Short mmCIF file of N, CA, C and O in Angstrom, two decimals:
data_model
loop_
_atom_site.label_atom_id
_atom_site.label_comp_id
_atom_site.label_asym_id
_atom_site.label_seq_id
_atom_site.Cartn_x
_atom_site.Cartn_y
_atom_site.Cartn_z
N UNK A 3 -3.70 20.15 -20.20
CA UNK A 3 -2.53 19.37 -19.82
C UNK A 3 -2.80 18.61 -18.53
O UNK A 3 -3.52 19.03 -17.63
N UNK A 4 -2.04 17.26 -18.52
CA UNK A 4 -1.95 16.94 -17.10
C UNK A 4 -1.48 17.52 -15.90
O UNK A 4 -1.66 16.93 -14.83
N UNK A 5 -0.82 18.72 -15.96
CA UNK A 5 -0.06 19.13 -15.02
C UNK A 5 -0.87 20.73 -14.75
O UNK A 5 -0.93 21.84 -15.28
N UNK A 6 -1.64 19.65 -13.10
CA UNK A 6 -2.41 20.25 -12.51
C UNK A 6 -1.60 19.84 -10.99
O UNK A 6 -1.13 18.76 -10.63
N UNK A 7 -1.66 20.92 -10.42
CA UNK A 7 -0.93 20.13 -9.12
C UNK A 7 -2.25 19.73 -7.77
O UNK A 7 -3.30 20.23 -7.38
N UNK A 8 -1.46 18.60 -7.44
CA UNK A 8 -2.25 17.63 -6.33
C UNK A 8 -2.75 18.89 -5.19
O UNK A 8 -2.44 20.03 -4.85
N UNK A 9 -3.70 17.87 -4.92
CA UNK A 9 -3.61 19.17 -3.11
C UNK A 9 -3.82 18.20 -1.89
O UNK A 9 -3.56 18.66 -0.78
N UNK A 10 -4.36 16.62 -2.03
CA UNK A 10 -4.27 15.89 -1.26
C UNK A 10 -4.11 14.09 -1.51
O UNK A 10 -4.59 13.83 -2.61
N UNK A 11 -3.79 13.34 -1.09
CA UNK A 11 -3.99 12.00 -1.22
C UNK A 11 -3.09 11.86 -1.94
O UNK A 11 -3.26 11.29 -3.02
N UNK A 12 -1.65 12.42 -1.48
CA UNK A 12 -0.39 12.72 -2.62
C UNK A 12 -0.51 11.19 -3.18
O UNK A 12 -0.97 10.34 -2.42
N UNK A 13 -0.04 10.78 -4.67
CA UNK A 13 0.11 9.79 -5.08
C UNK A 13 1.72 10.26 -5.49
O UNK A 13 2.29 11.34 -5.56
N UNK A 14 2.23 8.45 -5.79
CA UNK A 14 3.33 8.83 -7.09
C UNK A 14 3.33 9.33 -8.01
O UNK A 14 2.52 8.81 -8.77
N UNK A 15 4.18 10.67 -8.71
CA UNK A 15 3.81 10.97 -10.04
C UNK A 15 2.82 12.49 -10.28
O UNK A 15 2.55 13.26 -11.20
N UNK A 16 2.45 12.31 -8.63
CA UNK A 16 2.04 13.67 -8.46
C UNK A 16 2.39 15.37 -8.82
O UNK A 16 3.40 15.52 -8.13
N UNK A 17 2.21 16.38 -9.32
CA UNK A 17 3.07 17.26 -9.43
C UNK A 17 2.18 18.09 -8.32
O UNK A 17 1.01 18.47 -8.31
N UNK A 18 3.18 18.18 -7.48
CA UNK A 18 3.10 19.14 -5.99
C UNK A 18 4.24 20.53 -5.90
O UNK A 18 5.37 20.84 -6.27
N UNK A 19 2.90 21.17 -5.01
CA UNK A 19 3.49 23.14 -4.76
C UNK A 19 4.43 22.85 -3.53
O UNK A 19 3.92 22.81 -2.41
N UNK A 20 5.55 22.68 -3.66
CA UNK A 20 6.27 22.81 -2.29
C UNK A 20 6.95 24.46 -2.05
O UNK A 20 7.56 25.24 -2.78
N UNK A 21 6.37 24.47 -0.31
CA UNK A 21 6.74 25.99 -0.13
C UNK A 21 7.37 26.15 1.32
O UNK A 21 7.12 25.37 2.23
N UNK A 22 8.24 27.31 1.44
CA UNK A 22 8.27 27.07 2.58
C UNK A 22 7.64 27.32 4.08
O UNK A 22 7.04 28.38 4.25
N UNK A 23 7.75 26.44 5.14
CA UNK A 23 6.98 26.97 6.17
C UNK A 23 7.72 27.43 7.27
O UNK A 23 8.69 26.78 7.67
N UNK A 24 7.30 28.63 7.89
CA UNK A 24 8.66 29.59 8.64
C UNK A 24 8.26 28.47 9.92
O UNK A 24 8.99 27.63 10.45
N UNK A 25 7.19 28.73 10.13
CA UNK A 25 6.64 27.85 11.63
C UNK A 25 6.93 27.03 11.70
O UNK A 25 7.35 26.83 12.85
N UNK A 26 7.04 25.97 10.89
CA UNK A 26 8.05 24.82 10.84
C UNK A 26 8.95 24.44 10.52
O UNK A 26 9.23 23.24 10.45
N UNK A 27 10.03 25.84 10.06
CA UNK A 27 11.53 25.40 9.96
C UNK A 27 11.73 24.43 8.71
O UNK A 27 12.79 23.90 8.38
N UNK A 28 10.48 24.31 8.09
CA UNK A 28 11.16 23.21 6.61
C UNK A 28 9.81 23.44 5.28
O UNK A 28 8.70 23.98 5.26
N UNK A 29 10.30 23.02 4.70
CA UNK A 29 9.43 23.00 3.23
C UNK A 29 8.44 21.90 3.63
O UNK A 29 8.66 20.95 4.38
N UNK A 30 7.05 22.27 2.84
CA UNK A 30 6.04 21.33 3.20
C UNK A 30 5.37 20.96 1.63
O UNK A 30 6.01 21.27 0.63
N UNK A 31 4.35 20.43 1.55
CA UNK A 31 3.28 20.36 0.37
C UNK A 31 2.36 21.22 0.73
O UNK A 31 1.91 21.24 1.88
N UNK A 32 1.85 22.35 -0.56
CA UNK A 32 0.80 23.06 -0.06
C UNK A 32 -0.35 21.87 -0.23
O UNK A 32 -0.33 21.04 -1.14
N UNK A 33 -1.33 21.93 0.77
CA UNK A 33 -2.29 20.68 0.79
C UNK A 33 -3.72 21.73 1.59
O UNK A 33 -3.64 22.80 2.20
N UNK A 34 -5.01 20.81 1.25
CA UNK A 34 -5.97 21.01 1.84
C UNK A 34 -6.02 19.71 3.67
O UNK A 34 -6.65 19.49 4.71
N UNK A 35 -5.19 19.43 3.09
CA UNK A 35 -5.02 18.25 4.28
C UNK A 35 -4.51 18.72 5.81
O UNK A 35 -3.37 19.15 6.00
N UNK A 36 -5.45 18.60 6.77
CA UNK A 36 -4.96 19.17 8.24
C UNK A 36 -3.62 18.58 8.44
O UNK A 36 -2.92 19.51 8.86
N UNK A 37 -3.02 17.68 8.37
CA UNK A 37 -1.52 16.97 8.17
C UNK A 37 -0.98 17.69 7.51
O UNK A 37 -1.49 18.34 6.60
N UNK A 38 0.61 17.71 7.99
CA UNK A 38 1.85 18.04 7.81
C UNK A 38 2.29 17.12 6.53
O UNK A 38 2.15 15.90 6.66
N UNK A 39 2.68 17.50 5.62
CA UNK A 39 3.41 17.32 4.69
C UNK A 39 4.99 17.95 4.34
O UNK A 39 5.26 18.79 3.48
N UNK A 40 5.75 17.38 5.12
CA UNK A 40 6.87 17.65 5.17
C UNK A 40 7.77 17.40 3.84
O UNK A 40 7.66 16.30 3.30
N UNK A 41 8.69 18.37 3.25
CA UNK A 41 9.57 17.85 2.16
C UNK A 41 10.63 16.74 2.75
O UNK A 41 11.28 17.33 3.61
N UNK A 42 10.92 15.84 2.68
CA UNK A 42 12.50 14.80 3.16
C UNK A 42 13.58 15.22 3.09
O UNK A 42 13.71 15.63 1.94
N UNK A 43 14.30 15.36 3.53
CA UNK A 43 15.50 15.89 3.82
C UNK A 43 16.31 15.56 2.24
O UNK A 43 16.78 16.33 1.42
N UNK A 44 16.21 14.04 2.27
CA UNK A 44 17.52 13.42 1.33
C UNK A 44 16.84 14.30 -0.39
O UNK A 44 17.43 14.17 -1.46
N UNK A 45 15.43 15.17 -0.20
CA UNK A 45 14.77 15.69 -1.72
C UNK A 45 15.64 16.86 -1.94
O UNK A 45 15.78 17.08 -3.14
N UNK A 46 16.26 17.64 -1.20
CA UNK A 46 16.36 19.39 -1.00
C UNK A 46 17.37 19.54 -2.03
O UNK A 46 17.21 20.57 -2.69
N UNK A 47 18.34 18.86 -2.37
CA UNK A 47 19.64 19.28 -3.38
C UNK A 47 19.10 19.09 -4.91
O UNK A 47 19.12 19.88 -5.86
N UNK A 48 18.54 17.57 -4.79
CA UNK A 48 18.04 18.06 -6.45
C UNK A 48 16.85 18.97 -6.93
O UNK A 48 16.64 19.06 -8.14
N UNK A 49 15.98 19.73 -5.95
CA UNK A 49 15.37 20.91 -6.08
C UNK A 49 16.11 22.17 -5.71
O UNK A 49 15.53 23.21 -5.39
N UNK A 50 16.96 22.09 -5.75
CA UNK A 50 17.91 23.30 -5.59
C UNK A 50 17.50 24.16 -4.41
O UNK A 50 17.25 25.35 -4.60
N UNK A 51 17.38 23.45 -2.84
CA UNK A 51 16.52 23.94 -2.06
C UNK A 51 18.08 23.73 -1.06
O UNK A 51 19.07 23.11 -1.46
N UNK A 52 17.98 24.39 0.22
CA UNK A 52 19.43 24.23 1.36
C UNK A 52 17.99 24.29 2.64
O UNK A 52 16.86 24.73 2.81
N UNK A 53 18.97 23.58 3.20
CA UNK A 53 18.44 23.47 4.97
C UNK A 53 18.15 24.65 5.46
O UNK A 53 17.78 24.76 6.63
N UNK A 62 15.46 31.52 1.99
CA UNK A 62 15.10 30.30 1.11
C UNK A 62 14.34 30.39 0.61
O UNK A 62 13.27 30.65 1.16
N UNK A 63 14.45 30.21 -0.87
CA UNK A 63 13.51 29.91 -1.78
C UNK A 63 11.87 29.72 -1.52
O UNK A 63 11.44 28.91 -0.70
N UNK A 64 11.23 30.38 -2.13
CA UNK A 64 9.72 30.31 -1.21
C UNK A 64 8.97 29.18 -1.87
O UNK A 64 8.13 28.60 -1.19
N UNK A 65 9.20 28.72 -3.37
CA UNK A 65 8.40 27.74 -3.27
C UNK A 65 9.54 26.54 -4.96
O UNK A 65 10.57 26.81 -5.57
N UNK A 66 8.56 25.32 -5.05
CA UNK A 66 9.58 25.20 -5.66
C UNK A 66 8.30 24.33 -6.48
O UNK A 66 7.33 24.25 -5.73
N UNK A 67 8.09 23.69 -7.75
CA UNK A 67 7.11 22.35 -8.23
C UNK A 67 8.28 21.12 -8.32
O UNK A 67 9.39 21.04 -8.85
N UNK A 68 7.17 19.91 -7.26
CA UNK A 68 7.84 18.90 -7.86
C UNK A 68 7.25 17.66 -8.14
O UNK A 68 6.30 17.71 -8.92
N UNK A 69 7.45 16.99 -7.87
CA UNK A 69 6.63 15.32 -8.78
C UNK A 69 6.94 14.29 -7.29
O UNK A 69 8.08 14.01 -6.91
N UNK A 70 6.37 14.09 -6.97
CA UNK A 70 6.22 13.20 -5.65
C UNK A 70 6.59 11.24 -6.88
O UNK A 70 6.26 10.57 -7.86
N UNK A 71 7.82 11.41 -5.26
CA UNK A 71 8.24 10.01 -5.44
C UNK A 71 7.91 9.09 -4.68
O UNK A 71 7.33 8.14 -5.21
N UNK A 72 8.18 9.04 -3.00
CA UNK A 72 7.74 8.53 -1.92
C UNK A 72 7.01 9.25 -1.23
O UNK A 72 6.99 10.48 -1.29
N UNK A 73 6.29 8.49 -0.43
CA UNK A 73 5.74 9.18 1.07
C UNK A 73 5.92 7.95 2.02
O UNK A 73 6.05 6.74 1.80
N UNK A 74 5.86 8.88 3.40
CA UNK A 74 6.53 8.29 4.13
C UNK A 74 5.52 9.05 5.89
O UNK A 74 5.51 10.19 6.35
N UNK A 75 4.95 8.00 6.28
CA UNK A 75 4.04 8.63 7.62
C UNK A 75 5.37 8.51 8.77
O UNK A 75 6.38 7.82 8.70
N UNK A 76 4.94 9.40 9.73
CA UNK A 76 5.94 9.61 10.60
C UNK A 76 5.13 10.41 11.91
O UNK A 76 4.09 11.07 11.79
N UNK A 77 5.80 10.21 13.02
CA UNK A 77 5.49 10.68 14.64
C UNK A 77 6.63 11.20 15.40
O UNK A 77 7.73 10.65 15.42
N UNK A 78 6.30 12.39 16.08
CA UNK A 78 7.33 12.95 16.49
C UNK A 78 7.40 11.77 17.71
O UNK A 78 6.45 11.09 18.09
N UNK A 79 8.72 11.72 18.17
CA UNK A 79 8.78 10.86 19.44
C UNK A 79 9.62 11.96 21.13
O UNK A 79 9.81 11.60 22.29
N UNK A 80 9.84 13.06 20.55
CA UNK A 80 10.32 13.99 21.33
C UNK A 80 9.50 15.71 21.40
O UNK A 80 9.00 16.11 20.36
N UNK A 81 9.45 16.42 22.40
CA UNK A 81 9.04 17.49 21.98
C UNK A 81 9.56 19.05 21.14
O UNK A 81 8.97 20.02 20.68
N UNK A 82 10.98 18.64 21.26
CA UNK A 82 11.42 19.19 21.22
C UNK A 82 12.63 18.34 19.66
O UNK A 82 13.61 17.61 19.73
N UNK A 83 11.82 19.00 18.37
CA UNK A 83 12.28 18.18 17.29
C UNK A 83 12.65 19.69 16.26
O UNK A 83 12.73 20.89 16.51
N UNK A 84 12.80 18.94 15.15
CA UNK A 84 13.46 19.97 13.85
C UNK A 84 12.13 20.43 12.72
O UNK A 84 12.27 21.09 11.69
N UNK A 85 10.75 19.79 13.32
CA UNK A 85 9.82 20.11 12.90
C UNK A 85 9.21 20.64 13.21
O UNK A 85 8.20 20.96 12.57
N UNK A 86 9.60 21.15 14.80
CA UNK A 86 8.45 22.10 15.59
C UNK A 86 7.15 21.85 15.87
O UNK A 86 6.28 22.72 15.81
N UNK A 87 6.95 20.63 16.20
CA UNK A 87 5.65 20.01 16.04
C UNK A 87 5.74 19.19 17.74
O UNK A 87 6.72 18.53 18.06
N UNK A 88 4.50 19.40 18.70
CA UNK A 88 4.41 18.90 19.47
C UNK A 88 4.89 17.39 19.97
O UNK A 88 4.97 16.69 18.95
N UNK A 89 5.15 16.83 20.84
CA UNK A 89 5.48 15.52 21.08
C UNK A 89 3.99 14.42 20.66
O UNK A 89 2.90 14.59 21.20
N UNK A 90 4.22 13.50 19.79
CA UNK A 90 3.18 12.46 19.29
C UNK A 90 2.63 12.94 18.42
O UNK A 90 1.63 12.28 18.13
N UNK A 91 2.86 14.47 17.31
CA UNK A 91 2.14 15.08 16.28
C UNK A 91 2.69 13.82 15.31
O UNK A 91 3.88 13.54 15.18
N UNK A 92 1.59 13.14 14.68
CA UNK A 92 2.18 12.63 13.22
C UNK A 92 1.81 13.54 12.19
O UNK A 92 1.15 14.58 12.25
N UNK A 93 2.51 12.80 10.97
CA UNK A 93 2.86 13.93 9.74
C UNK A 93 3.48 13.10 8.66
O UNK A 93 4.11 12.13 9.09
N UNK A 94 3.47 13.22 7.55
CA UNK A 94 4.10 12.90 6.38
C UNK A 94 5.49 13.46 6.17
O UNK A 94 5.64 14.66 6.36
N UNK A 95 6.49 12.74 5.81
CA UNK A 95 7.85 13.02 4.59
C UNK A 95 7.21 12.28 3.14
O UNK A 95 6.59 11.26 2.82
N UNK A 96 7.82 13.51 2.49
CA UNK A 96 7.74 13.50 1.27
C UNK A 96 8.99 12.90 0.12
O UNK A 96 9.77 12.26 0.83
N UNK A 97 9.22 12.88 -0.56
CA UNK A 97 10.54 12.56 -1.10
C UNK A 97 9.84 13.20 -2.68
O UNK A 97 8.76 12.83 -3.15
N UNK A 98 10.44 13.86 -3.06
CA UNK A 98 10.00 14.69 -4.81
C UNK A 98 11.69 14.83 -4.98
O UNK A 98 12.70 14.80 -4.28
N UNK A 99 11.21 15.03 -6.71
CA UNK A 99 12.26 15.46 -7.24
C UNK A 99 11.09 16.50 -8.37
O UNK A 99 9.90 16.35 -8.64
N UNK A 100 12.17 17.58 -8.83
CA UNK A 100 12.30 18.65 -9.82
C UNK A 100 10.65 18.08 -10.48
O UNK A 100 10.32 16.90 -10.43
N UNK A 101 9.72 19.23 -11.09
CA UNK A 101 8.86 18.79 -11.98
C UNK A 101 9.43 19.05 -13.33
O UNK A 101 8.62 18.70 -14.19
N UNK A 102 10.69 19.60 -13.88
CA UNK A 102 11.63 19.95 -15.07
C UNK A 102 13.17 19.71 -14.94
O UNK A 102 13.92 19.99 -15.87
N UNK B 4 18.54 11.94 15.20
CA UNK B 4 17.49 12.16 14.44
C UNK B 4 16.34 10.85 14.68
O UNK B 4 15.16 11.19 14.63
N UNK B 5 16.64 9.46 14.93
CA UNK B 5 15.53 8.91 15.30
C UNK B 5 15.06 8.82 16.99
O UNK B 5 14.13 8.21 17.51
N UNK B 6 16.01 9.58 17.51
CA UNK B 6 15.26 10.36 18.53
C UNK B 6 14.30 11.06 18.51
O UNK B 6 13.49 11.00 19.44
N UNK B 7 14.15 11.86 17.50
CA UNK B 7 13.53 12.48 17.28
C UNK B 7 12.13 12.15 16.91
O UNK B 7 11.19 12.48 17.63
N UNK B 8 11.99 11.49 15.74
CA UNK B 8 10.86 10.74 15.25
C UNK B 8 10.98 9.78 14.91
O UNK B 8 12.10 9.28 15.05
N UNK B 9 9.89 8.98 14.25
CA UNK B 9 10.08 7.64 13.76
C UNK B 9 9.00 7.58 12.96
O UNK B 9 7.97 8.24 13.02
N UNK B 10 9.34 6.67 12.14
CA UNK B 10 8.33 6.25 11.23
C UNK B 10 6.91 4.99 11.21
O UNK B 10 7.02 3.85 10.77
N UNK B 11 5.77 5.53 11.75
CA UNK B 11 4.68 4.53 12.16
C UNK B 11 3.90 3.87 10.83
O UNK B 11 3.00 3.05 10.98
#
């Protein structure tokens, strides 16, 4: 079958392991990639996920690069860490 | 929240 899940160079259409990460307070992509792969906020309701579930499959829609601009953020990630948002929905 | 971060 096609449905092998990604581990880096997320594309569209991808089917990705999202799990959660305690250290960072949010769901990520499991990845071989030293980058943060963050889930998007606006993804969490139609994976039946709340602001927990330890992991969830989903199908990558967007990505989205991003930089913290404060040190003190909701990602727990140093001031100037960049990182990916993700945007998935459900793989079913 | 775009205090926070931003998108580069």
């Amino acid at each position: 079958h096609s449905e092998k899940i990604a581990i880096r160079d997320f594309q569209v259409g991808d089917l990705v392991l999202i799990i959660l990460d305690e250290r960072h307070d949010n769901y990520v992509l499991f990845t071989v990639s030293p980058t943060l792969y963050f889930l998007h906020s606006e993804s969490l309701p139609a994976l039946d996920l709340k602001p927990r579930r330890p992991w969830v499959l989903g199908k990558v829609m967007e990505k989205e690069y991003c930089q913290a601009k404060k040190a003190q953020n909701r990602f727990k990630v140093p001031l100037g860490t960049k990182f990916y948002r993700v945007k998935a929905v459900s793989w079913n | 929240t775009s205090s926070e971060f931003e998108v580069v």
